[PDB]
Write a protein that binds this ligand. Structure first.
Ligand SMILES: [K+]
Ligand SMILES: [K+]
Ligand SMILES: [K+]
Lengths: 16, 16
């Protein structure tokens, strides 16, 4: 849990 | 739904 790549909030593919 | 900012796969804070 923290910052980097995977899932959660930020930049990439999913929902606005 | 698609690319840009929000929730889902990619970079920023969460899990992975
Ligand atoms: K992430
Ligand atoms: K999106
Ligand atoms: K995201």
């Amino acid at each position: 849990v923290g910052a980097x790549a995977x899932v959660x909030w930020x930049w990439x593919w999913x929902w606005x």
